[PDB]
Design a binder for this molecule. Sequence first.
Ligand SMILES: *C(=O)CCCCCCCCCCCCC
Ligand SMILES: *C(=O)CCCCCCCCCCCCC
Ligand SMILES: *C(=O)CCCCCCCCCCCCC
Ligand SMILES: *C(=O)CCCCCCCCCCCCC
Ligand SMILES: *C(=O)CCCCCCCCCCCCC
Ligand SMILES: *C(=O)CCCCCCCCCCCCC
Lengths: 115, 115, 115, 115, 115, 115
Amino acid sequence: GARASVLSGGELDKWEKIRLRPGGKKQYKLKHIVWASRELERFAVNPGLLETSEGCRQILGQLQPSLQTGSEELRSLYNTIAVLYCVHQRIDVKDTKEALDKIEEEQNKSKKKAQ
Amino acid sequence: GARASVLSGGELDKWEKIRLRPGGKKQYKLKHIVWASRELERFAVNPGLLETSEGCRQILGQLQPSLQTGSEELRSLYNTIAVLYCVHQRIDVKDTKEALDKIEEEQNKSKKKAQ
Amino acid sequence: GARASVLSGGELDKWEKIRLRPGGKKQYKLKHIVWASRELERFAVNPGLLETSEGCRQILGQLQPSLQTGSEELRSLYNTIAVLYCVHQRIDVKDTKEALDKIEEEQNKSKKKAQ
Amino acid sequence: GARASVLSGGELDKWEKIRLRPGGKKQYKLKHIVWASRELERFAVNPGLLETSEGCRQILGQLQPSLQTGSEELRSLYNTIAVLYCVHQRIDVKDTKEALDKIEEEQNKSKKKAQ
Amino acid sequence: GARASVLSGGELDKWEKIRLRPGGKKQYKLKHIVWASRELERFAVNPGLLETSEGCRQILGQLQPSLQTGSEELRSLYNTIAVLYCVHQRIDVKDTKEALDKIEEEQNKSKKKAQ
Amino acid sequence: GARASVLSGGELDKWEKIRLRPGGKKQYKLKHIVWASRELERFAVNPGLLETSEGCRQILGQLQPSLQTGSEELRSLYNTIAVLYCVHQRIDVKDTKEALDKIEEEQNKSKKKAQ
Ligand SMILES: *C(=O)CCCCCCCCCCCCC
Ligand SMILES: *C(=O)CCCCCCCCCCCCC
Ligand SMILES: *C(=O)CCCCCCCCCCCCC
Ligand SMILES: *C(=O)CCCCCCCCCCCCC
Ligand SMILES: *C(=O)CCCCCCCCCCCCC
Ligand SMILES: *C(=O)CCCCCCCCCCCCC
C-alpha cells in the first residue's frame, strides 16, 4: 500500500526534490523514510500514522518537547517527519526549513484559535 | 519470593483464567508478565511496579498518553497491566476490556475526589 | 589538552574525593560519567548536554517526572548528574545524599521570586 | 461479478489496506470475503445484500444485538460487513474501531431527527 | 484447581443432586453440560456465559421469546441453563421445574420495583 | 530538476521556439542554459532559483542596478533570466522584447501600490 504515495508527481518523487539542507544538491532518499519508520517503531510511534497527516501533526506536537534535548538522529527524524507532513499536506518546499516554518505557523494558526 | 504468588486463589491463579481480549478464547499466561518485565526494563521503568495496584495505577498513567501512538505490543502490555491492576485490587475481571473499563472508572472516581 | 585531567583543584580532583555512601569508603569514578554518556545516547538524548550546568538542568528537568516509576539505573543516572551539577556549580558536597540535599535547596529559589 | 469490486480504488484494494484492528500490521483479506458470504448464508442472509449499503445497514440493524452474547467470528462478521458497508459509502477508515465509531454514528444522530 | 468439582456442597455437587424431572429418579449429569457446550458452539453463543449467573440471565432473556416454537434439545438446553443459573446464584433447587420457578420469580423482582 | 524544464508544453519547448534576440536567427539551445546555470553558480546564485519565477524575479531586481555596466554574457543571461521568469509564469513571447516590456510592467505593477 505504501507504493501509492511513491508515484511520480506524488510524495516520493517530491521528496527527492526536497533538500536535506537548503543549499545542497542532495535530497532525502527513500532509505531515510525506511529508517524513520524503524526509528518510530523504536520510539513506540506507530508507522501507519505516517500516511495520516493529523497523526503526524500530533506526533510532531508530542516530539517538539523532546527536540531540544534529543539526539541528532532525532532532529534528523523530526525534520524528516516535518517534511513528510508538508508533503502529505501537498504544500511545496524546496527544502527542510520551509516546512518547519509552515508548521510553527500552522501551530500559530492553531494558537489563534487556541484562545 | 515468587513462591508467595503461586497459592490457589492467588493472583496467578486468577491471571490464568482471564481472557486476553473480551471475546478471546485464550487466557493470560505468565510469559506475558515475563515479556512485560523485560519491556519495562527496556523503557527504564521498574518492573516491580507490576506487583502492586499503586505501581500499576502509576504505570498505566505513564503509558496511557502513548497508547494512541503505540504498537500492539504496547497496547497488549497496557492491557496486561490493567488486568494486573484489577487483580491486585481484588477486582475479579474476566477480560481486558472490563479491566480497562475499571481503570477509566477509577479515573472518573478520582475526578470526584478532585473537583 | 591532556594537562586538564591532571589538574590540582579541578573537577576530577574533586570528583574522586566524593563518597558513594555518606560515611562510605568508596568514592566516585570516571567510568560512571562514561556509563551515563552512553546511556543518554541509548535514550536518544544529546550527550553534549553533560558538559554544562544548563544542559544538565534540562536533563534533570527531563528525568524528574520519570523518577517516580524509574529503574535503578535511571535513578543512578539522575544521582550521577546531580553530583556533577554540584561540581559544575562549585557546590561543596562530600557525598550523594548531600548532593540531593543541595539540589532540593536550589530548586526552592524559583519559589522565592514567585511574588 | 465479484471481480468488479477487486479493482484498484474498489473494495479489495481498500480492504487490503484496512487494519483488522486499529493497532496492527494484519490487514483484511479476500478469503475473509468469501467467508463473509458463507457466514451470511449460515444466517439466512442473502450475500447479494453486501453489494448495497442499505442492504448492509438494515443487516447491521438486524445483526448488532447478537454480538453481546455470540461468537468472535460473528463479531468479525459484523465488523467485516461494517467495513463492506463503509466501502460502499466510501467512509475512509484505516481500521475497524473507526468503522465502529462511524457505524454507531450512522445508527445514531438520525435518531435525534427521527424522534 | 480440580478440587473445585468434588467440593462438598459445591456447584457440581448440587448439579448431580438436582432432578432432571420432578417425579423422576434421574439427576443432572455433567454430560448435559458437555452436550450443551457443542450446542452453544453450534448456535454461535459464547460458552463462558454459562459460568455466570448474569451471563446465564442474559441468555435466558435472549432465549425467552424463542421458546414457544422450539426443539426438545433447545428446551433441554434452556432448562439446563436455568438450572445452572440457579446453581450459580446458590439457590438450592431440587429439580428442573424449580429452577424455572426461580427464574420467573427473579424476573419479577424488578417488575415489583418497576416504579 | 533541470529535467522538469525539459517538458513538452514546458520551458524547453518554449525556449527552442523563442528567438534569442527580438529577431534572432538562433533560438535557445540547452547548452546556453547549462552555461547560464553554471554562470549563476559563478555569481553566487543558487540554480534552484532558476526553477521558479520567484527566484528569477528576485535575481533580476538585484541584478538590475548592475545591468548597465555588466557583461554581454550577463545581459544575454539577464534576458534569458527574464525569459526563464516568463516561461515559469507561462507568459508567451516569441522573442525577448516583449519580456522586457512585461518586466518593466512587473516593476511598474510592483511599484503601483507602493504608497
Ligand atoms: C504496499 O505498497 C505494500 C508494499 C510495502 C513495501 C513497499 C516498498 C517500496 C516503497 C516504500 C515506500 C515507503 C514510504 C511511503
Ligand atoms: C522467591 O520465591 C524466590 C524465587 C522462587 C522461584 C520460583 C518458585 C515457584 C514455586 C515453585 C513451587 C514448586 C512446588 C513443587
Ligand atoms: C593541553 O593542555 C595542551 C597540550 C596538548 C599536547 C599533549 C600534552 C601531553 C602532556 C600532558 C601532561 C602529562 C601526561 C598526562
Ligand atoms: C460474476 O460475474 C459472476 C461469475 C463469477 C465471477 C467470479 C469472480 C471471482 C473474483 C475473486 C473472488 C471473489 C470472492 C467474493
Ligand atoms: C487445584 O486445586 C490443584 C490440585 C492439585 C492436585 C491435587 C491432588 C490430585 C490427586 C489425584 C490422584 C489421582 C486421581 C485419579
Ligand atoms: C534535475 O533534473 C536535476 C538532476 C538530473 C540532472 C541530469 C539531467 C539534466 C537534463 C538537462 C540538462 C541540464 C540543464 C541545466
